[PDB]
Design a binder for this molecule. Structure first.
Ligand code: HEM
Ligand SMILES: Cc1cc(CCC(C)C)ccc1NCNO
Ligand SMILES: [Cl-]
Length: 422
């Protein structure tokens, strides 16, 4: 595809053209989206928007959009005010889906910390360092297979590498048999792709997929309750929180959170990273000339640039005012990481994709504090190893078409990215 000029700011977007409540807005290209958030940061840093109407979802009240880095950081660090209960997407959750989506991410402390403590050891730096060889093995073989399977030197990066790598890693951590990885992939994509006609627009399919992955979780849990294995599902069924085992719905919700969180966002970080190296070849050249020296900053700049999670939602527990804006107890609040990560008052040259950027206190893993991404160290490893394997096996891998972008307010997804190599 065409490259662009690195450092170019987005087009001006008049504030009257911005409709965060319309699915059509989220189909526009990233230049327009980035320009819209730049206009909000400048002219309306806290503003109120209707909730997008999705067939079968509960619309409910609209939300206050926090677009400034400092406000997203403030909300994240004050959970006694900005609660993660009852949901962390904007749209209200049906009582039927609460059975499958009531994990620790929609809970406050103390119960959130008790739940997180069941699995946190498995994601600490020493424990993930052990997973590193498996990441290396899977990434090496996926890229080798891309080359063996495609003598025409053309393939889809998403289906051949970015998707399978994080999926295989988290499924093995969970104890899921390899035969079932494609069902997990499909379920993940329906749950986080709803509203995109290429994935699912029918709510019956969304509820069927939810029910099926919940039933799958429950059967695997029952098996592990009979026969322990060295995996996260056995951890879940063996835990006790003050002498009480987790309920079937708590187990199903934990399993679904871990599986979905563990593959989709990393997949999109890799695809956006390859697209950026394609658009800014100077950065590829710099990184390839010193891979290990630049990898720390390069991986962080890929996450800042991609912002794979566009926003997370909070709910006020009390009246507050910020920047002169009075917000009421019970109001929804949306935290726009995609905007915080272009905030001109926090980042020098925010429109420059600079793989040497340092410091880089981006909010791609959230604003910090109680819910800080459990998998951040694992994600950074998977990204660094995927790019090292591309450098080694197909260093000129480059996108040949513009991405097919996922239609989503929540996930900065790429459905397909055709690439070519020498
Ligand atoms: C580049 C990849 C990733 C990105 C951009 C990302 C982003 C995020 C964000 C924005 C949050 C919410 C943070 C907050 O509310 O303050 C989060 C939470 C979480 N992430 Fe990730 N994540 C990534 C990879 C992973 C991986 C590989 C896993 C492995 C399972 C994972 C597991 C989780 C979990 C379990 C939570 C909920 C934590 C809690 O509620 O305490 N994430 N992530
Ligand atoms: C994309 C996403 C969605 C959610 C809520 C949706 C359900 C499936 C838990 C939670 C975490 C993440 N990702 C975090 N880390 O990848
Ligand atoms: Cl103030």
């Amino acid at each position: 595809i065409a490259t662009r000029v690195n450092g170019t700011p987005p087009p001006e977007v008049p504030i009257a053209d911005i409709e965060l409540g319309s699915l059509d807005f989220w189909a526009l290209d990233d230049d327009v989206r980035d320009g819209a958030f730049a206009t909000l940061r400048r002219e309306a840093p806290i503003s109120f928007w209707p909730t997008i109407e999705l067939p079968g979802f509960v619309t409910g009240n609209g939300h206050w959009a926090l677009t400034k880095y400092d406000d997203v950081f403030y909300a994240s660090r004050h959970p006694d005010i900005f609660s993660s209960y009852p949901n962390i997407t904007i749209n209200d959750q049906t009582p039927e889906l609460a059975e499958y989506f009531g994990s620790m991410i929609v809970l406050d402390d103390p119960r959130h910390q008790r739940l997180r403590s069941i699995v946190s050891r498995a994601f600490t730096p020493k424990v993930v360092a052990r997973i590193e060889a498996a990441v290396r093995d899977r990434a090496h073989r996926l890229v080798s297979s891309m080359i063996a399977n495609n003598p025409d030197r053309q393939a889809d990066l998403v289906s051949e590498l970015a998707g399978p790598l994080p999926l295989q890693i988290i499924c093995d951590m969970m104890g899921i048999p390899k035969a079932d990885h494609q069902r997990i992939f499909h379920w993940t994509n329906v749950i986080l792709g709803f509203g995109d006609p290429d994935l699912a627009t029918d709510f019956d399919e969304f509820m069927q997929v939810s029910a099926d992955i919940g039933a799958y979780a429950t059967a695997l849990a029952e098996d592990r309750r009979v026969n322990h294995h060295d995996d996260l599902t056995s951890s879940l069924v063996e835990a006790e929180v003050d002498g009480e085992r987790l309920s079937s719905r708590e187990i199903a919700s934990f399993f679904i959170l871990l599986v979905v969180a563990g593959n989709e966002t990393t997949r999109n970080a890799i695809t956006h990273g390859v697209l950026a190296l394609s658009r800014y070849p100077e950065q590829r050249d710099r990184w390839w000339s010193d891979f290990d020296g630049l990898a720390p900053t390069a991986v962080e700049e890929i996450v800042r640039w991609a912002s794979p999670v566009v926003y997370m939602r909070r709910t006020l527990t009390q009246d507050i005012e910020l920047r002169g804006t009075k917000m009421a107890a019970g109001d929804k609040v949306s935290l726009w990481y995609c905007s915080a990560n272009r905030d001109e008052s926090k980042f020098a040259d925010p429109w420059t994709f600079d793989l040497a950027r340092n410091p880089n206190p981006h909010l791609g893993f959230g604003g910090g504090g109680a819910h800080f991404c459990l998998g951040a160290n694992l994600a950074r490893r998977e990204i660094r190893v995927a790019f090292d394997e591309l450098r080694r096996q197909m260093p000129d891998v480059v996108a040949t078409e513009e991405p097919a972008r996922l239609l989503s307010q929540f996930i900065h997804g790429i459905k397909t990215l055709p690439v070519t190599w020498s």
